[PDB]
């Protein structure tokens, strides 16, 4: 199939995601509605169930709401069974309507539906070319109180009906008993509880294996992708071992939530996105769009900077999921604000790099503050709004104009209020003009583009006061006026003759797994695929089309590799870098080093004999290690993904800047478990 097909679970770059709070969308089946005090059919009390379910979703899919908008993927609430208690938080009653309070990951939330309803959801969606994504929140179970076991469900965890354990009397040590996090450090926010939610302990084999098996069930149920919750609150290595579990089984596009505030830029965040095996929700993008288009606390220069910086910081920028709002922020649209702000922000997002996500109700101009105010019931299914139409005209370009789906981004004109950028990929171009100034038009002269000579109509048809563009020789546009609040899209598409790789997924897996290479100009004849210098051709290439190639990872050593393709005539493509070949299936192992004292600004790191440990390359060592919570300085620890059942040699190092100090003696050694987790405790050798 082509890169654009509903069946492509590895690439969402050509899609438009619609984020839905199941409960708050559409109650298509009143029979599964909770009853009594857990339910409010008026949906006036935003903390209770309103009754929205899978059936309702199916209904809106079939009646043209979503399809008419141009939406091609839906992201829904965590489908697993949640706790049934009503929690009174100081007078107020709270239900698990949101789906973040898991009790059993192997069952469904009966208020959403049955497994059968789930299967129907998948079917109907797929039938309409819509991919399905689900939320998955393995960091915890539910709100618990260790000495008030009667509170809620004591964070009880069940394995398909079987009680595994509770927060009180956790002799198995299924959970963390370190208190609550103050969000003070990253380590602090991982090994302590989030609020009162029972923190799952991923270092417990039971827990480890359980979750890895649970996700497989959903995978087998046909999902298209996963949205991981609280990735910043779980161990990095564990998560990587989790991703490996998914990828080495049935890969699907996965993205996690790592909250970023205004003006916040985190290197931990970049590294995580670049190395864990998953991508992230683009908070950096969201926050910046809001400052510029919403709160006017930054200008075009700021947007520009975010665009260029993010492209340099994320190895795969096109995999970051963009948005203007979601369940954790107040609604972009403010009661009294000018609607054109929302419309422009939408237009901007839909035509920018990454994977756009639209929070349900945006198209309806919903307003609301933070939780739960931003989780109201969609007031209507009218296609008559301007926002609905904007989406409707733009979403589809992601599928038909690869410049939008995979192109580079380049500023062509700019001022405080205006931004003109160009997207480009192969013989395809898109040019977007945005004028945030709601009161002043702008005089656009000197605009140069890659568009061929001719006249271009605004793809928005003037909907946001866009105009026509006139390109002369050299791609120079003649002068024009960009209306106040003006937004225009111009484009050019043509066949690409040379092989051009636009995307690859998954980005990390063991030899033998099939990966998907998307782009253009591959031709219809099987060519060759290179992993570094290794050539792959023939049978291992399971499928070859002009826009997509499916190939099995050869059995090469674990490491990072560049991917390139050559058509049947031998013409080579551009390189796609950062592909990770695992050394095999992975397990999560905790490394502990005793008495490794350091000087200020000096941290301990881990290295070793396998690619997963950097192959003795200090520039690729794991760390810095932690030393506050689980173990205390001068003892250090860290959770790491490693090849299962392998005998590994390793050493620790003290790094300062790029200056490194090695542990003395000889390599420590160990053999990874075959499954489950393990803990290796050693002393630092001077």
Ligand X SMILES: OC[C@H]1O[C@H](O[C@H]2[C@H](O)[C@@H](O)[C@@H](O)O[C@@H]2CO)[C@H](O)[C@@H](O)[C@@H]1O
Catalytic (active-site) positions: 229, 257
For ligand X, which stretch binds (CB under 6 A), given 20-28, 534-542, 627-635, 638-646? 627-635
Which H/E stretch holds residue 541?
A: strand 541-544
CA distances from 76 to 140, 283, 315, 611, 634 (A): 19, 19, 27, 36, 44
Phi, psi values for residue 237, rounded to 5°: -60, -40
d(CA 266, CA 256): 15
| From 4, 10, 33, 349, residue interacting with Ca ion (rule: CB under 5 A) | 33
**Residue 187 Cβ, how far from Ca ion at the closest point, in Å?**
11
For Ca ion, which stretch binds (CB under 5 A), given 126-134, 232-240, 393-401, 605-613? 232-240
Q: Tell me, by CB under 6 A, how many residues bind ligand X.
A: 21
- Told to check if 301 binds ligand X by CB under 6 A, we report no
| From 33, 583, 627, 635, residue interacting with ligand X (rule: CB under 6 A) | 627
**Please, which residue, 62 or 669, has the CB nearer to ligand X?**
669
Structure tokens at 93: 């009653």
| From 45, 470, 514, 667, residue interacting with ligand X (rule: CB under 6 A) | 667
CA distances from 436 to 331, 338, 419, 432 (A): 19, 11, 8, 13
β-strand pairing of 576-581 with 508-509: parallel
Site string for Ca ion, 412-451 (x = CB under 5 A): ----------------------------------------
- Told to check if 616 binds ligand X by CB under 6 A, we report yes
- Told to check if 600 binds ligand X by CB under 6 A, we report yes
Contact 508, 243 (CB under 8 A): yes
- Told to check if 633 binds ligand X by CB under 6 A, we report yes
Contact 384, 474 (CB under 8 A): no
**Please, which residue, 347 or 621, has the CB nearer to ligand X?**
621
For 4, residues 6+ apart whose C-beta sits below 8 A from its C-beta are 14, 399, 547
d(CA 25, CA 33): 13
Residue 662 binds: one of Ca ion, ligand X, none (C-beta under 5 to 8 A by kind): ligand X
Residue 29 binds: one of Ca ion, ligand X, none (C-beta under 5 to 8 A by kind): Ca ion
**Please, which residue, 270 or 304, has the CB nearer to ligand X?**
304
| From 233, 290, 333, 654, residue interacting with Ca ion (rule: CB under 5 A) | 233
- Told to check if 109 binds Ca ion by CB under 5 A, we report no
Using DSSP's 3-state secondary structure scheme, residue 20 falls into: coil
Residue 413 binds: one of ligand X, Ca ion, none (C-beta under 5 to 8 A by kind): ligand X
**Please, which residue, 130 or 469, has the CB nearer to ligand X?**
469
For Ca ion, which stretch binds (CB under 5 A), given 134-142, 308-316, 579-587, 594-602? 134-142
For ligand X, which stretch binds (CB under 6 A), given 101-109, 234-242, 513-521, 594-602? 594-602
- Told to check if 153 binds Ca ion by CB under 5 A, we report no
| From 19, 139, 181, 496, residue interacting with Ca ion (rule: CB under 5 A) | 139
- Told to check if 620 binds ligand X by CB under 6 A, we report no
Query: Which class for 659: exposed (0-12), middle (13-18), buried (19 or more C-beta within 10 A)?
Result: exposed
Polymer length in residues for the chain: 686
CA distances from 331 to 176, 228, 358, 374, 382 (A): 34, 22, 11, 6, 19
For ligand X, which stretch binds (CB under 6 A), given 256-264, 502-510, 578-586, 601-609? 601-609
| From 14, 29, 204, 496, residue interacting with Ca ion (rule: CB under 5 A) | 29
For residue 352, whether the previous peptide bond is cis, meaning omega lies within 30 degrees of 0, is no
Q: Could you say which residues in the range 386-445 bind ligand X, by CB under 6 A?
A: 411-415, 445
Residue 161 binds: one of ligand X, Ca ion, none (C-beta under 5 to 8 A by kind): none
Contact 340, 464 (CB under 8 A): yes
- Told to check if 308 binds ligand X by CB under 6 A, we report no
**Please, which residue, 315 or 414, has the CB nearer to ligand X?**
414
| From 10, 17, 20, 51, residue interacting with Ca ion (rule: CB under 5 A) | 51
- Told to check if 599 binds ligand X by CB under 6 A, we report yes
- The residues after which the chain has a C–N gap greater than 2.5 Å are none
**Residue 496 Cβ, how far from ligand X at the closest point, in Å?**
26
Query: Which class for 555: exposed (0-12), middle (13-18), buried (19 or more C-beta within 10 A)?
Result: exposed
- Told to check if 598 binds ligand X by CB under 6 A, we report yes
Contact 395, 350 (CB under 8 A): yes
**444 - beta bridge partners?**
480
* CB-nearest residue to ligand X: 446
Site string for ligand X, 441-470 (x = CB under 6 A): ----xx-x----------------------
Query: Which class for 465: exposed (0-12), middle (13-18), buried (19 or more C-beta within 10 A)?
Result: middle
Nearest 5 degrees, angle CA 33-CA 37-CA 40?
55
Residues that bind ligand X (CB under 6 A): 411-415, 445-446, 448, 598-603, 616, 627-628, 633, 651, 662, 667
């Amino acid at each position: 199939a082509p890169d654009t097909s509903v069946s492509n679970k590895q690439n969402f770059s050509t899609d438009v995601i619609y984020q839905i709070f199941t409960d708050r969308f559409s109650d298509g089946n009143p029979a599964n509605n909770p009853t009594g005090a857990a339910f409010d059919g008026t949906c006036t009390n935003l903390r209770l169930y309103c009754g929205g379910d899978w059936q309702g979703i199916i209904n809106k899919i079939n009646d043209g709401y979503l399809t008419g908008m141009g939406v091609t993927a839906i992201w829904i609430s965590q489908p697993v069974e949640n706790i049934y208690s009503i929690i009174n938080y100081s007078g107020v009653n709270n239900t698990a309507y949101h789906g973040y309070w898991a009790r059993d990951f192997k069952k469904t939330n009966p208020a959403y539906g049955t497994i059968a309803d789930f299967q129907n959801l998948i079917a109907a969606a797929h039938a309409k070319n819509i991919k399905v994504i689900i939320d998955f929140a393995p960091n915890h179970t539910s709100p618990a109180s260790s000495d008030q076991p009667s509170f809620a469900e004591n964070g009880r965890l069940y394995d398909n009906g079987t009680l595994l354990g509770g927060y009180t009397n956790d002799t198995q040590n299924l959970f963390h008993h370190n208190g609550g996090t103050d969000f003070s450090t990253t380590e602090n926010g991982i090994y302590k509880n989030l609020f009162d939610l029972a923190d799952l302990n991923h270092n417990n084999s039971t827990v480890d294996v359980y979750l890895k098996d649970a996700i497989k069930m959903w995978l087998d149920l046909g999902i298209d992708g996963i949205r991981m919750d609280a990735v910043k609150h779980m161990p990095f290595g564990w998560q990587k071992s989790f991703m490996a579990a998914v990828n080495n089984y049935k890969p699907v596009f996965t993205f996690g939530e790592w909250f970023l505030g205004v003006n916040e830029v985190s290197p931990e965040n970049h590294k995580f996105a670049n190395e864990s095996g998953m991508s992230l929700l683009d908070f950096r993008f969201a926050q910046k769009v809001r400052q510029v288009f919403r709160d006017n606390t930054d200008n075009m220069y700021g947007l520009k900077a975010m665009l260029e910086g993010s492209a340099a910081d994320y190895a795969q920028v096109d995999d970051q999921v963009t948005f203007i709002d979601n369940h954790d922020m107040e609604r972009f649209h403010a009661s009294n604000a000018n609607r054109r702000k929302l419309e422009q922000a939408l237009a901007f997002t839909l035509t920018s790099r990454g994977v756009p996500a639209i929070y349900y109700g945006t198209e309806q101009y919903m307003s609301g503050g933070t939780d739960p105010d931003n989780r109201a019931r969609i007031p209507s299914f009218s296609t008559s709004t301007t926002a609905y139409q904007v989406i409707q005209k733009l979403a589809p370009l992601r599928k038909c104009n690869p410049a939008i789906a995979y192109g580079s981004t380049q500023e062509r004109w700019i001022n405080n209020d205006v931004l003109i950028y160009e997207r480009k990929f192969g013989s395809n171009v898109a040019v977007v003009a945005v004028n945030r100034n709601l009161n002043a038009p702008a005089s656009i002269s000197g605009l140069v583009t890659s568009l061929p000579q001719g006249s271009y109509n605004d793809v928005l048809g003037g909907l946001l006061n866009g105009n026509t563009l006139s390109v002369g020789s050299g791609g120079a546009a003649s002068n024009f006026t960009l209306a106040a609040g003006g937004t225009a899209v111009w484009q050019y598409t043509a066949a690409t003759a040379t092989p051009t790789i636009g995307h690859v997924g998954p980005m990390m897996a063991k030899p033998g797994v099939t990966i998907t290479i998307d782009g253009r100009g591959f031709g219809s004849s099987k060519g060759t695929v290179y992993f570094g210098t290794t050539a792959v051709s023939g049978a291992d290439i399971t499928s070859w089309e002009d826009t997509q190639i499916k190939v099995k990872i050869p059995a090469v050593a674990g490491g990072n590799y560049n991917i390139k393709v050559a058509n049947a005539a031998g013409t080579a493509s551009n390189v796609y870098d950062n592909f990770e070949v695992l050394s095999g299936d992975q397990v999560s192992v905790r490394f502990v080093v005793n008495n490794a004292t350091t000087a200020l600004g000096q941290n301990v790191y881990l290295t070793g004999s396998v690619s997963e440990l950097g192959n003795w390359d200090p520039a690729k060592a794991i760390g810095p290690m932690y030393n506050q919570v689980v173990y205390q300085y001068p003892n250090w620890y860290y959770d790491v993904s490693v090849p299962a059942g392998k005998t590994i040699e390793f050493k620790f190092l003290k790094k300062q800047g790029s200056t490194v100090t090695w542990e003395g003696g000889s390599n420590h050694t160990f053999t990874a478990p075959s499954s489950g987790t393990a803990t290796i405790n050693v002393n630092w050798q001077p």
